[PDB]
Amino acid sequence: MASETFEFQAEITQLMSLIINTVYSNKEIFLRELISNASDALDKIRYKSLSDPKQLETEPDLFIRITPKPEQKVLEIRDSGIGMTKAELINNLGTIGTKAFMEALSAGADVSMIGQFGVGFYSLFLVADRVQVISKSNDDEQYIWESNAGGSFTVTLDEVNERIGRGTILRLFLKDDQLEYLEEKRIKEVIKRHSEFVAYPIQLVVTKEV
Ligand SMILES: O=C1CCC/C=C\CCOC(=O)c2c(O)cc(O)c(Cl)c2C1
C-alpha cells in the first residue's frame, strides 16, 4: 500500500532511545506492561459494549494471546480489545507525560515503574529493536503502525496480515540476544509472575511436533 511516514514527538523518541539502548537486566518486564495495556484495551471494549452490545459482534471473545514465531524471531501479543483507528494509532503511539518518567529514571527510578507513568508500551524496546502494531477498530479498516525505535514511524493500510476480528497485535521483532522469549517455558514462567490478577484469559500458542 501507500505507506505514510510521520515524525515522533521529541520526548517519545528520547524515551525509546533511552530504552532500546539501556543495559537494564530485568527486561522480562515488557511482558507485564504489554499484557497490562492489552487488558486495559479489553476493559474499554467491554465497557463500551455495555451500552452498545453490537460492538462485541466483530469478535465476541475477549482474550489475550501470545504467539511465538521462532522462524521470524517474532513474538506477538494479541488482544481482542477495542482497537485503534488510523488516527488513534497516530496519536496514542506517537503523541500522548513521557517526560516525567525519563526524569524519574535520571533520579534512579525503576524501569519497571514505566507503567506508572503510562508509557509501558515503549518497554517493548527492551527485547525488540523493531515493532509492528497491527490494529483493527470497529470504526475503521485494519492498519499497520511500524517503528524501529527511530525518530519516524509509518502507517499503512493492512493488506498483508491476517484479518483480526477486532483488537490489536503487537508484532515484536525480538533482538538476537533476547530470543529466549520465544520459548514456552520461559514465556509461561514470566507470565505466571507479574500477571496474576487479570480478568481476561491469557492464551499461549504453542507449536508441538507430532
Ligand atoms: O493506548 C494504548 C493502551 C492504553 C489503552 C487505551 C485505549 C485502548 C486502546 O489502546 C490499544 O488499542 C492498545 C492495545 O490494545 C495494546 C497495547 O499494547 C497498546 Cl499500547 C494499546 C494502545
Q: At which residue does the C-alpha cell 471494549 appear?
A: 45
* 149-187: b (≥16 Cβ within 10 Å) or e: bebebebbebeeeeebebbbbbbbbbbeebeebbeeeeb
Residue with CA nearest ligand 1 atom 6: 41
Q: Say if ligand 1 is within 6 A of residue 84 CB.
A: yes
- The count of structural domains within the chain is 1
The enclosing H or E element of 64 equals strand 64-69
Q: Which of 205, 200, 163, 202 is nearest to 45 (CA)?
A: 200
Q: Say if ligand 1 is within 6 A of residue 66 CB.
A: no
Tell me how long the chain is: 210
Residues with Cβ within 8 Å of residue 13, at least 6 apart in sequence: 150, 151
Whole-angstrom distance, CA of residue 42 vs CA of residue 90: 20
Q: What is the resolution of this structure in A?
A: 2.7
**Angle, alpha carbons 103-41-162 (nearest 5°):** 115
Q: Which of 193, 148, 164 is nearest to 78 (CA)?
A: 164
Query: What CATH number is attached to the domain comprising 111?
Result: 3.30.565.10
> How many CB atoms sit inside 10 A of residue 86's CB?
17
Q: Say if ligand 1 is within 6 A of residue 81 CB.
A: yes
Residue with CA nearest ligand 1 atom 20: 121
How far apart, in Å, are the Cα atoms of 17 and each of 49, 59, 96, 118, 148?
Answer: 38, 36, 17, 17, 10
Q: Say if ligand 1 is within 6 A of residue 133 CB.
A: no
Residue with CA nearest ligand 1 atom 17: 37
The strand order across the sheet containing 152-157 reads: 4-7, 152-157, 143-147, 128-136, 167-174, 74-79, 64-69, 202-204
Contact between 105 and 18 (Cβ < 8 Å): yes
Q: Say if ligand 1 is within 6 A of residue 164 CB.
A: no
Residue with CA nearest ligand 1 atom 19: 37
Q: 31: domain range? A: 1-210
Whole-angstrom distance, CA of residue 150 vs CA of residue 142: 23
CA of 208 to the centre of ligand 1 (A): 31
Burial class (CB in 10 A: 0-12, 13-18, 19+), 108: exposed
Burial class (CB in 10 A: 0-12, 13-18, 19+), 88: middle
